[PDB]
Design a protein that fits this description.
The structure is cut from a larger assembly and holds chains A (218 residues) and B (227 residues). Chain A has 218 residues and is of the alpha+beta class. Chain A has 5 helices and 13 strands. The chains are: A alpha+beta (218), B alpha+beta (227). Chains A and B meet through helix 1 of A and helix 2 of B. Chain B: Pfam families: Proteasome (PF00227), Proteasome_A_N (PF10584).
Chain lengths: 218, 227
């Protein structure tokens, strides 16, 4: 029961970012710290999930084969909107046979100069928005990203990267099953690229964290 | 002469006449040629047009069956299309179950097996097509032919259909160890322009495809400028 933690995404003026960490856990044990959890689908789309890794692998292998074959056999390249619809009907069908896909997905892409971002949960609920998250990202990160999207005009790429890193910083401080090693995917100009892993800067040296002040008996 | 009404009966001499008759449909169809270079494989076929008002790409005889492999049909096209579907399913099975691209020799033997089974049972007839299979997986470049009997063989160069006797003569004056995929397209197209009979079939065009290093072992139609 290898499992992945949080995923977060946000739209900016010209594209969309998706981020998560490179870790799979088994219960509390941090078992594999060097796992690429984001998967490219066709020409325009990337996906990630929180929860059971085996179910993420089965579902994404199946969708990737359908997309490559439909193109090879003469039925065109599926868009992010169509891929998302297809994913959601598969998750709902499995829920309806009492054999659920125990993951929560985030999907991002770019097609037609128009960015896409959406989530699907394990009973088949679906939504699209300017920011989306799964796992603890839904409690920790959405509040920060929703405040950054309040400014009128939208975010630049640089502002979007900066607020994404503040979110990853808080997940590392406050989510138990996490490591400080993340990747960012960028969908813009009708393609997706995945960056190299990086780490964020953290603060541990406040006066209020010192040995004397935190002592229980004085 | 009741012995030639179904494929489930031998004749006194040890023949199966329904299968021979199905082969006669291939021998009366349009010509195809193919060649195996050191880089890859090239296939070309003549399309007889039935109207001057067709769109381009209509009644295509060449079809991809995986990233690295393709098929060309001779004889009856709708029969060929049923074999193309089967082949697509075998290539997918190999990726999904065994995690490999199907080797060329294995793909050809499954296509043969499938065609043979329609020569055994009173309720079905044999296919009226021969299939050229062209592949470049981990077993190198490979070219095979399967006919209506289900017989399968490997070739360096091959011709099928009504121009085949002459076309074979001209493929024997090629050097198979040395030739590249850009030379091949010029020679193969020449053979097909020369055997075309201008009295019987007035309108025609050529269709050409390849899989090679230049293309990254991807099977595809050649760009229409190279003819």
């Amino acid at each position: 029961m290898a499992s992945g933690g949080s995923v977060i995404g946000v739209k900016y003026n010209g594209g969309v970012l998706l981020a998560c960490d490179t870790l799979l856990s088994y219960g509390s044990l941090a078992k594999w710290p060097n796992i690429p959890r984001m998967k490219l689908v066709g020409a325009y789309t990337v996906m990630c999930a929180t929860g059971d890794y085996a179910d993420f692998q089965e579902m994404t292998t199946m969708i990737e084969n359908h997309v490559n074959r439909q193109q090879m056999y003469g039925g065109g390249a599926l868009t992010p909107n169509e891929v998302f619809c297809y994913l959601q009907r598969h998750v709902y069908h499995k829920r309806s046979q009492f054999e659920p896909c125990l993951c929560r997905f985030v999907v991002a892409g770019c097609h037609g100069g128009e960015p896409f971002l959406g989530g699907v949960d394990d009973v088949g609920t679906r939504w699209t928005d300017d920011c989306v998250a799964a796992g603890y990202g839904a409690y920790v990160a959405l509040p920060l990203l929703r405040q950054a999207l309040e400014k009128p005009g939208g975010l630049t790429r640089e502002e979007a990267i900066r607020v994404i890193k503040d979110c990853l910083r808080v997940l590392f401080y406050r989510e138990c099953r996490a490591i400080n090693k993340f990747q960012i995917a960028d969908a813009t100009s009708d393609m997706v690229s995945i960056g190299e892993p990086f780490e964020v800067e953290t603060n541990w040296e406040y006066d209020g964290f010192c040995f004397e002040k935190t002592a229980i008996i004085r | 002469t009741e012995h030639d009404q179904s494929t489930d009966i031998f004749s006194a001499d040890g023949r199966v006449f329904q299968v021979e008759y199905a082969c006669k449909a291939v021998d009366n169809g349009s010509t195809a040629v193919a060649a195996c270079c050191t880089d890859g494989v090239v296939v070309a076929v003549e399309k007889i047009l039935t109207s001057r008002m067709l769109e381009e790409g209509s009644n295509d005889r060449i079809h991809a069956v995986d990233r690295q492999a393709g098929v060309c049909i001779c004889g009856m096209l709708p029969d060929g299309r049923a074999v193309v579907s089967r082949a697509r399913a075998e290539a997918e099975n190999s990726r999904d179950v065994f995690a490999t691209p199907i080797p060329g020799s294995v793909l050809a033997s499954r296509i043969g097996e499938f065609m043979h089974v329609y020569t055994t049972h009173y309720a079905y007839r044999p296919f009226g097509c021969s299939v050229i299979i062209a592949s470049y997986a981990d077993d190198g470049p490979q070219l095979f032919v399967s006919d209506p009997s289900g017989t399968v063989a490997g070739y360096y160069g091959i011709a099928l259909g009504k121009g085949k006797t002459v076309a074979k003569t001209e493929l024997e004056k090629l050097n198979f160890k040395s030739i590249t995929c850009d030379e091949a397209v010029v020679k193969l197209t020449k053979i097909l322009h020369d055997v075309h009979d201008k009295s019987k079939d007035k309108l025609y065009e050529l269709e050409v495809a390849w899989v090679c290093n230049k293309s990254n072992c991807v099977f595809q139609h050649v760009p229409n400028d190279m003819i």
